[PDB]
Amino acid sequence: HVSWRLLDVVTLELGPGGPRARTQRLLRQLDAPVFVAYCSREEAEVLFAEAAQAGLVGPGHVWLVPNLALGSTDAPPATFPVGLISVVTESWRLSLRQKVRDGVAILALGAHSYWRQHGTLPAPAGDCRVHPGPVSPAREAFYRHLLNVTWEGRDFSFSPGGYLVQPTMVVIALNRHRLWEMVGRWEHGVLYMKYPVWPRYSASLQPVVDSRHLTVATLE
Amino acid sequence: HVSWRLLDVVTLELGPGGPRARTQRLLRQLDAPVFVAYCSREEAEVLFAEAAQAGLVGPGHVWLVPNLALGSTDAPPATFPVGLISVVTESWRLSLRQKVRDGVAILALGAHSYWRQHGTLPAPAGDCRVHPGPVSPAREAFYRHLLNVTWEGRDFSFSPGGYLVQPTMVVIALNRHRLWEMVGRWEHGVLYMKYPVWPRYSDSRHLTVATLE
Amino acid sequence: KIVNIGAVLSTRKHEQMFREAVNQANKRHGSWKIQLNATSVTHKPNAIQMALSVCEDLISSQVYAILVSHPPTPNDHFTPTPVSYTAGFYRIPVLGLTTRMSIYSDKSIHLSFLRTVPPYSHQSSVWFEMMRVYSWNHIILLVSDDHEGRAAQKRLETLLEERESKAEKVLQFDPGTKNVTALLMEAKELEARVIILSASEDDAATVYRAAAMLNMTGSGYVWLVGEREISGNALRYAPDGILGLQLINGKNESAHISDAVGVVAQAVHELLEKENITDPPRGCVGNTNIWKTGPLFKRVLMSSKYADGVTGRVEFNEDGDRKFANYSIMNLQNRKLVQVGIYNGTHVIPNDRKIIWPGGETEKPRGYQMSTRLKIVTIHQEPFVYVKPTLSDGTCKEEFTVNGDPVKKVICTGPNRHTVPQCCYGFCIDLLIKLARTMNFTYEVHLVADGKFGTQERVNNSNKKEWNGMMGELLSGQADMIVAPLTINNERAQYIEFSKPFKYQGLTILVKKRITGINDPRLRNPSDKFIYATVKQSSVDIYFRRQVELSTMYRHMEKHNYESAAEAIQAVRDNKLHAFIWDSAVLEFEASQKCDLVTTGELFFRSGFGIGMRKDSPWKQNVSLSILKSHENGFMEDLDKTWVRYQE
């Protein structure tokens, strides 16, 4: 609904080798309270270091990145601004063993759901050396029945492309003590937040408060 | 007394062609029928060049700048908009000999105006090597009397700030000849206009409309 | 690479200190990537010769910066100009170790100039901070006609206007003057009592002597001065407890040299990595050019900070200011100065003993010494303020009422030419009686000198607009309160402040027994059948003028209207006027009182009544509280039924 007045889009060579002076000049000329960035982890560290050099990381601006950057999720490196916002899927804090338990469960339910339909488990087709096989209808039907699954109150529905559709993403942000923490959930297209206003921190912490913002009380 | 509803004010930073990106974005989102600019002659060639790429030199738009820019009035440069209004002091077309004669005449007119008082013909200071002049003697009357002396029916009242107060000034513009021409004087505080309607000579705008009774 | 820097001093002993400082700075970075040199030149009694000496020094090497200091000469004004002009011709950045003149901050005249000590005009921020901390709102500023004093007063006024508070009274005297008791007498007749002083030492001493002779240095007064007014012969005779300020380590002339050298070295270290090595100019005759990267070097040096300086962290403002240097509060404790607190321009921290005040009291004085004898202005309106002539005995005739109590009457003088005394009574007079009894003051009622309610207007051949009538009298200072049916509008609220409303009303139509609200074309378009009028120089005129869509109606009204009163009601009665527009209560009382008059329709634009008072007057809170408590008591209902409801 909102107009979403775009300000500027820029593409720069943030690779291991290149002219840093040109990128410094381009970053030095910008004016916008909100940034959205897309790059790789090494590109992310280079870009954030350069932004810290050219004073774009203070309490005035806000940065946003997708899940492609930020890497390990358990070891935030240096030069990562506090207040970084990303969006990751559910189960961003489970164990490796827990994830495999979900992986075997989804295969087991898929076979069981197909079992109720036809009472069988399709035979394997594993001749890597021979490499035979035209289009096969039995395996195709098994794969088609493998798409939708639901168990333990978690809806896994894969689109025709190999990605799941309608998940419950959780937004995360970098706390004041260099630690990822949850900020806001998302569940059937309605967003929630832990904070009614965005906490703004400073170089020496001591969260600053906007002078031209005020809270209004009332009732019905 | 007019309402004089202003649209916006923008402060640019234009110089060598290194930092010339934010200014283009600032000028791209500004629209007005009339602009008043303030920059030196060394920055006009940049600001008009940037404005010409953002659609700000069409006949529907007009400009107005002070006399600080356009230093070389004899040969106006390129990339300047056609029909830019500026204000210059009197005798803009006068010759150098005329200017020297006018200055000498003003100085000698002040000297003779004091001479009519039959007081003296004050002598200047000694030299530089002694650093003289600790106080101001009665010679300040010479400076005072050198203020309100006119010549050839031209007011030369000098303000205490060192600038003349109310000579006559004219308005000039660039016609379709790359040559400045007079438009109207401002004698006695009344504006004269040679053109009852602005010519607006030369996608577009400013379409003409007719109604009747 | 060899990097050369220059300096100019006059000690011939601190030059060795500068050499040691530059050597120590080169010890921080001496890997032959950048190598530092040093040059120095002494001052001369001749300014021109000093100029050619600076020329020779600049051509001596490829200088990149210039450092200048104050010699033992007593002419501290024009001392750094001969070097500054020649350096700025070539756009060579310079730094001033010790300088306080406020003429070098004009970047349009001095192209390249930096500084490491706060000039004299930046005290105003400290004064504003002190006023905010101590909560002193009504202040008086006395200054001189010099450029620095005018600039400081302008800065203080700009800060106050940003706070939207303004100054109570500003008075300035020409420099080098004596026997100036007239200005002090003029400033002594105001309620606000706090003095801000800024002048030379001799002027400060003369002002102190005049004030001591004028008794204005006693109790109840708190006057603060700057740093130049507490030195020399001025500090000899001065009232005790005078507040002041001083620099942290100013006039050292040696502590700032190390900081300047370090800053120059740090700037030139980063500058040398640029692609544009302009090779700063070497030449003084025939070189009619400028340094290609002079502005770049100036910008780089401006945005270069320091880690640990002797005078603290060093930064630069938009023009080269000291960037929050320290300041030390001072006092006058029995002919001896003393430190009372330390402030760095952002906050004050009292870390010393108690501070005494000119009257010798320990309690913190408050400004706005309140009076007790106010003048009151009013206007003649029928239901509210009745004007009657007095008897020969000196008292106007008594008039009892059916309730059993007499009507209160007061004596009002002023009305027209004449200034004869009369008697005033009615609604607003009773309200004034109760208000004065509650808030403990004395009144001297009078009338206006024009008859108009008051309307802002700008006369011809002028750019300033002055209020007329009662409103103009209030601002001019002739009246301290306005007890009259004065409506509250935005334009009025711009320049004064009202109390809470004590009566609500609006505008309606008076017609002698087709007329309706303002929608008929007979009213929208002029016609001889129906003629409407107002009272000019009033609020209704402004209301109908502040409407583009009603220009024709405004022109019709401006064709003819009354500068009058109930006389306009008579004009309606005499069939001369068709209908009248005015305040609701005024028309309604007369419509229900006499006979044969009826109000048409109902109110269409509503507004209230209020007492007028000067900007940020201290009387506002108590007036509002008393009015509210009289609303809720039921007293205003009794007053209403007595004066307005006893009809029909």
Ligand SMILES: *[C@@H]1O[C@H](CO)[C@@H](O)[C@H](O)[C@H]1NC(C)=O
């Ligand atoms: C989708 O879910 C239904 C419900 O259990 C199941 O019967 C079906 O096999 C699944 N797959 C497809 C392709 O319908």
Ligand SMILES: *[C@@H]1O[C@H](CO)[C@@H](O)[C@H](O)[C@H]1NC(C)=O
């Ligand atoms: C010009 O100024 C001088 C000041 O010395 C004064 O005496 C003289 O009357 C002035 N002339 C006019 C025409 O006002």
Ligand SMILES: *[C@@H]1O[C@H](CO)[C@@H](O)[C@H](O)[C@H]1NC(C)=O
């Ligand atoms: C009124 O003033 C008198 C002295 O002038 C004082 O005695 C009395 O207490 C005061 N009353 C109030 C309510 O201020």
Ligand SMILES: *[C@@H]1O[C@H](CO)[C@@H](O)[C@H](O)[C@H]1NC(C)=O
């Ligand atoms: C207002 O009333 C308070 C107490 O109610 C009193 O202290 C104060 O002096 C009054 N204000 C003025 C301006 O007299």
